[PDB]
Amino acid sequence: LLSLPLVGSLPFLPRHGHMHNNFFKLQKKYGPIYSVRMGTKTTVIVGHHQLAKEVLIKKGKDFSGRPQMATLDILSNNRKGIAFADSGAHWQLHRRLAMATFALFKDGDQKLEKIICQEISTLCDMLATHNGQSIDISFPVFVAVTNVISLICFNTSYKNGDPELNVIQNYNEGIIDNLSKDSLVDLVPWLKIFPNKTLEKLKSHVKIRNDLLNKILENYKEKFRSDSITNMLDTLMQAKMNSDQDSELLSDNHILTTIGDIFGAGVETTTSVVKWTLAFLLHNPQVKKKLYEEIDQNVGFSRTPTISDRNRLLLLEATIREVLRLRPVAPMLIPHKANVDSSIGEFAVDKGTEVIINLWALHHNEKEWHQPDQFMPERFLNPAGTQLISPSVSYLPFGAGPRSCIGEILARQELFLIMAWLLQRFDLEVPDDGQLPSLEGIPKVVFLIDSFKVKIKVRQAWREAQ
């Protein structure tokens, strides 16, 4: 009896389980690095820290490209901006300019810390009005980080109730919904196989974002003054005029897309990580208690938390690290591409090949982490409890090398201060129908969590101390 001709083969079911996990499970059979061919395109998945660092750092330049995707073409206006732009002059310039802008916020009058604390104050005052009630903290937190990133991009913010905030939220949700069904990584390109309206819907949401950004740029062409460079838009406009090989790379569209990447990332990443952190604390009341104890003893109630408090609030800084391990914002980073013929772990990799780092695998490798599927912030502390440690070399929440996260400083500060101020001021408890958030998650371009509610109450201790 003969065997059928095989015209296709995939190692697991599509749309069943999470991609990053399915790739991980495959490592038991096939090892830490393997490939899949889809028509013409070849993709390599890497799931061990040694090989990953070779791709991100040692041979960083070789693998610093980004593959092209139809959905991403639309969001990025054909591969402009930073995150989805191929390696090249545009990417390098705009990335550099964006980084240079965060320097303008490291100290002084417009210090990043104060900008953030300003908006966390408004957030806390608003949340306190919901004393006694169960609520979804998504929108209130969304506003807070939106204002922070707006101040950094334009030196503007939004008053309570500005409906432009509801507009942004709508298109943010719609774009994220249609940019990918699940992860950006998608074995079969269903998009091109069956008739569908994904690109149509995606365009309609992107159009609204772009119209709003254009509106902002046009209104700002007048307020721009050369001697005063205080925000990201200033920096980008100052560069364009400074010419005078550089000027074609700073068109209006190049500038808006870059601002768009920053505005989007600044808001959806940090918002997501905050929700994830709360969710874990509702599942782990023992940890939560230890965090209240820690903050009462090291900051108390006579002032509000500041960045310098990260030197004393160690369990908090560790809790954040452990969320970023267990539920990475980008569990498969963003896809990389080989710019040139090269190699990984002595295996050949052709120019143009897609390369994916399975960070989830790195963060859950059993030989590198003790009980990796557990939420244990303790692992990032010495046994004493008195200083932070790095227990594994297999940890890269913000990536590394040329395409590493450029918003890391901002993220870490936003996350630390938000959690700090909330814990000082609020009991955050399971709602009265004792529903706990699902920790399973929803993979999109970002690793999101199902919406959930939290009962919020002002703390007796915080009240007494007024």
Ligand code: HEM
């Ligand atoms: C918890 C928060 C965040 C985490 C864990 C995070 C992590 C990451 C990761 C894993 C990557 C991909 C690295 C790669 O593709 O090799 C990335 C890229 C990027 N991140 Fe974030 N990020 C966070 C927040 C932010 C924020 C607040 C910004 C604000 C500007 C930002 C801006 C970017 C940009 C522009 C890229 C593209 C880099 C490039 O292609 O050159 N991120 N980030």
Ligand SMILES: C[C@]12CC[C@H](O)CC1=CC[C@@H]1[C@@H]2CC[C@]2(C)C(c3cccnc3)=CC[C@@H]12
């Ligand atoms: C789609 C979205 C967010 C929805 C916006 O309407 C469009 C947008 C621009 C930037 C995207 C961002 C989602 C987060 C992305 C993909 C991101 C990011 C994501 C996670 C970690 N670090 C960076 C950088 C580009 C960011």
